[PDB]
Structure formats: C-alpha cells, structure tokens
C-alpha cells in the first residue's frame, strides 16, 4: 500500500448539549448518516438524545473518512450482536486492529479511536441525580461498586465531589465494558478501580488509575482519564490487541467530509 | 410507590411529563446505561419486578401506570 501514512489515536469531543442546529443543518446531518441510524435517531423523543446519537455517528464517519480515507459515502458501519459500532470487515483498512467507540452523556459526545490498542470510552457529567437525593441515588447504585470503591466515594464531605467520584468510577467501568464490547450484562461489581489521582485538573490526561477484575489486577489495561471540562469526566480504556487531549469539534468539523447517504424525505 | 411513573420519569431526566407521550418507549425517551440500572432497581424494590434490559428498554410509561395500579 504505497500511500502508507502512520495513524495515531483520536480523541474528539463535540458539545452537542449546546449545539443548536437549524432545521436545515439537522436535515444535513440526518441525510449524512446510514438509513437504519437515521430512523433510530428519529425515534428519540428528545433533542438531547437525538443530537448526541447524531454527533456520535457523524464523528465515527468523520474518523473513518479522515483516518481510513474511505469516502464517507462508502463507509459501511455495522454493529456487533451486543450493539457496538464496528467498521465492516471488508477493508479499505490495512489497520486490522483499528477500532473506536463513542460516548454521549452530559453536554458532549466523545469519541476515541486507536489504530492498534482496542479501546472503549465513556463520558459522564456530574449532574445532580434525576431522582432522589445523592445518598438515595448511591443506594440505588450499591450493587455496582465495591466497598473499597464506595469508601473512596464517600471519603469526601462534599456530596458534589462524592458525585464526581461516583461518575468517575462509573465512567471507568463503562470504558472497560465498552472496550470489551459486552454490554449491560457484566456484573460491574467484578471491577474495582483504584482511582488515582483523586483530584483531576482540566486539560490533562491521567494514566495512573489501575483496574482490578475479580481481585486480580488487569495489568493489560490502561485507563486514560480526563475532564474535557470542569463537569465532564471521560475514561478511555485501552487494551493491547494481544499526551493527546481531546479536541472540541464543531458542526462543520463533523460535516467536513459528509456526503448525503439517504435521499430527500420531508 | 403509587407514582413510580414519575420516579422513572425523573430517572430519565423528564420533568412534568405532561409533555410526553406515555406510549413512548424508555429507549425513545433516552434511557442511558445508568438510567437503566436505576429504573431496574426501582422496579425491583417498588414492584418486585426484575426486568430484562430489553424489557426495560421497551417499557412505556403507560405500561408503568398499568404495573402500579395492579396491586
Ligand atoms: C450503549 C451501551 C453499551 C452503553 O451505554 P451508555 O454508557 O449509557 O451510553 P454511552 O453514551 O457511553 O454509549 C453509547 C454508545 O456506545 C456504543 N455502543 C453501543 N453498544 C455498545 C457496546 N455493546 N459496547 C461498546 N459500545 C457500544 C454506540 O456507539 C452507542 O452510541 P449510540 O447508542 O448513540 O448508537 C448500552 O447499550 C449498555
Ligand atoms: Mg452512520
Ligand atoms: Mg481534525
Ligand atoms: Ni426527585
């Protein structure tokens, strides 16, 4: 393959929670994604969810279009049995290990992609829980973190910090879950993270948090933790198939390589 | 308890819910992974109902109004 070109990991964020597309721009977006994905996005009752899903899809296609140089119209995205987006086996892809993943919680849709490292991502906004109080919420969530994890979570007198740590510990678990592609069906209590360092500054990728699966350290797993802003935590779980801050994209970035896929339809 | 419907609305981050088709699925209303865990833990403790993920995803709010009335 003459036009080789060494590929590097991608870390993109898009603030969909403050993206306010016009009828025209949405329709642009909607036509730029795959038919099945259109219909789905169009089933979401709320802008919040539809925009996230949409930002997610536009970002994957951008990533493949740009990094794999497949013309957007010919990007064949699919999904594993358990719902993970994957690129079709038929290549335009001499990166057999090239994989990616998105998350969309809070105001952002984030995406990681790597050429070799198999990867999972999860973003989480520290927001007051939708039902009940924090303590109540944490109660509802007991069965999902280890005692040591909870001691760390309640180790802070401020319930916002507590929530911060909870969402962090959660995101770390999802990144891994999404990395391995398994779904909700994975007893999250099997996973214990040693959250390190406790206090994370914005504008920095922390690689120090190590994981224990079933009490044995999962030494084959790196975790990249950042706060893309003061309120969103992002975990990127990286396994070997055996520095880079997130880049805030805007709409035109998302569409830069877009070609319309589905026809005109009122 | 009686209005579990609200409790899961609030879990979904929906408020009022007067402006929500009760026939919308929880998926369509934006059920997160976290939300999923909450809703499922709520229907356990409140309704003694353990639901598949698929079940919870396809739960309508009307289908909730049904499941609390029955008691
Ligand atoms: C989606 C899922 C795996 C995780 O849910 P979550 O942490 O609340 O949602 P996130 O925003 O972090 O992840 C959603 C994205 O993960 C990806 N995804 C879906 N299923 C996945 C899975 N089995 N493993 C890894 N990623 C998955 C998709 O791109 C999905 O985006 P989409 O639902 O807009 O199409 C859920 O099905 C469990
Ligand atoms: Mg698509
Ligand atoms: Mg770029
Ligand atoms: Ni409440």
Author numbering:
A (entry chain A): 18 to 259, 276 to 299
B (entry chain B): 2124 to 2194
Can you list sentences taken from the study reporting this PDB entry?
The posttranslational modification of a conserved serine residue in carrier proteins with a phosphopantetheinyl moiety transferred from coenzyme A through the enzyme phosphopantetheinyl transferase (PPT) is vital to all living organisms. Whereas microbial genomes contain more than one PPT, only one PPT has been identified in mammals. This enzyme exhibits a broad substrate specificity and is able to phosphopantetheinylate the ACP components of the cytosolic and the mitochondrial FAS systems, as well as aminoadipate semialdehyde dehydrogenase, the human ortholog to the yeast lys5 gene. Human phosphopantetheinyl transferase exhibits an α/β fold and 2-fold pseudosymmetry similar to the Sfp phosphopantetheinyl transferase from Bacillus subtilis.
The serine acceptor residue for the phosphopantetheinyl moiety in ACP was mutated to alanine to facilitate crystallization of a stable ternary complex of PPT, apoACP, and CoA. The type I human ACP binds in the cleft between the two domains of the PPT and the essential Ser2156Ala points directly toward the β-phosphate of the bound CoA. The interaction between the two proteins takes place on a large interface and is mostly of hydrophobic character. Three hydrophobic patches on the PPT surface interact with the ACP. A few polar interactions that involve hydrogen bonds and salt bridges can be observed (ACP-PPT: Arg2138-Gly137, Asp2151-Gln50, Thr2165-Arg138, Glu2169-Arg138), but binding specificity seems to be determined by shape complementarity rather than through the few specific interactions. Upon binding the ACP, the two domains of PPT rotate around a hinge consisting of residue Glu133, and close slightly (3.9 Å at the furthest point from the hinge, or approximately 10 degrees). For the PPT-CoA-ACP complex, the packing within the crystal lattice is different, and this region is no longer visible in the electron density maps, indicating inherent flexibility.
